[PDB]
């Protein structure tokens, strides 16, 4: 009973110094326990580790972990979790994997720690490191949460890495979770800027003739219209018309937006289809900022200017 009474008073100051991030005070308390005869435990070095972590110091935390391991006591799961979080914040993916292997040889479950590692690596802007760590974990046999899948896919598609996004999608579908319209739209966001209008159309046909959860949305039609419109190899004008005809699904939430009208006007302008271009520009006028969206920063030939020139040349000056 007396040993518990002493351990209470000692651990009180230990945890207080740990929560106020005084590593020197924690070492003093540990040496005080050593002198008073109270042998340290996995809970004592936990305070030292978290005190080193809260001060964004990694070498001190590694020294504390090595001291705890030399003490003959198995480290707690919280200590390894904090070390993994610190390594993910800094960006040391290899040391994080070493910590994960150290947890695995100690029979600890490494799923939650691996998820925290990949999440911190994504947050720390180390996207490729998080991707390769996730691939290693998937090859190992571990599973991931849906939020991790969505975050990885979205970040890889925003960066422009379609390969890792497709690999993560394949691993997700292998793990039992099917893909929804969000993942397909994220993939098409990268597939449209390739320059080949047939790689996006394959995904569009996969979505269209698939299940209800993976059915296309307005963003999908917009991406495929952008892919077909900005081609550089062939005509691709009847393709846009057939895609617009397929886009005619009133009671399927498939309604046009500003991007749809802008892309349709641009396409019909580039191919001298002035009547349908005016038809869609009349709809684009109703949205606020639609002409600004049509002028897509001037990167693609100023489609608004091309529309104005097409109106001027034929003589339809009232529409001008």
């Amino acid at each position: 009973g007396t040993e518990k009474v002493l351990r209470l008073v000692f651990m009180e100051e230990l945890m207080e110094r740990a929560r106020n991030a005084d590593s020197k005070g924690v070492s003093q308390v540990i040496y005080d326990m050593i002198a008073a005869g109270l042998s340290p435990g996995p809970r004592s070095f936990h305070g030292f580790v978290v005190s080193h972590v809260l001060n964004r110091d990694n070498d001190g935390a590694m020294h504390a972990l090595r001291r705890e391991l030399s003490e003959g006591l198995r480290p707690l799961h919280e200590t390894f979790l904090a070390l993994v979080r610190l390594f993910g914040a800094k960006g040391l993916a290899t040391r994080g994997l070493e910590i994960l292997a150290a947890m695995e040889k100690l029979k600890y479950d490494i799923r939650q720690a691996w998820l925290v590692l990949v999440e911190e690596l994504v947050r720390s802007n180390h996207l490729e490191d998080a991707n390769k760590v996730f691939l290693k974990g998937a090859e190992g046999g571990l599973r991931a949460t849906d939020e991790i899948y969505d975050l990885l896919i979205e970040q890889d598609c925003k960066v422009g890495d379609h390969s890792n996004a497709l690999t993560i999608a394949y691993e997700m579908e292998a793990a039992g979770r099917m893909a929804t319209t969000f993942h397909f739209n994220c993939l098409l966001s990268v597939q449209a800027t390739c320059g080949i209008p047939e790689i996006a159309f394959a995904t569009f046909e996969n979505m269209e003739y698939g299940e209800d959860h993976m059915k296309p949305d307005t963003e999908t039609y917009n991406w495929v219209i952008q892919a077909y419109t900005r081609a550089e190899s062939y005509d691709r004008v009847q393709d846009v018309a057939e895609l617009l005809g397929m886009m005619v699904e009133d009671h399927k939430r498939v309604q046009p937006n500003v991007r749809t009208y802008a892309l349709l006007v641009e396409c019909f302008t580039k191919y001298c289809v002035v009547r349908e271009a005016i038809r869609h520009f009349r709809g684009l006028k109703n949205f606020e900022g639609g002409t600004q969206v049509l002028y897509n920063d001037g990167k693609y030939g100023d489609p608004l200017s091309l529309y104005l020139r097409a109106l001027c040349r034929e003589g339809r000056i009232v529409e001008l």
């Binding site: 945890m15 207080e16 936990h46 305070g47 978290v50 972590v53 809260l54 919280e78």
Partner: peptide, 8 residues
């Protein structure tokens, strides 16, 4: 986060 618990 990683705040350590207080015994009291």
């Amino acid at each position: 986060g990683d705040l350590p618990p207080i015994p009291s």
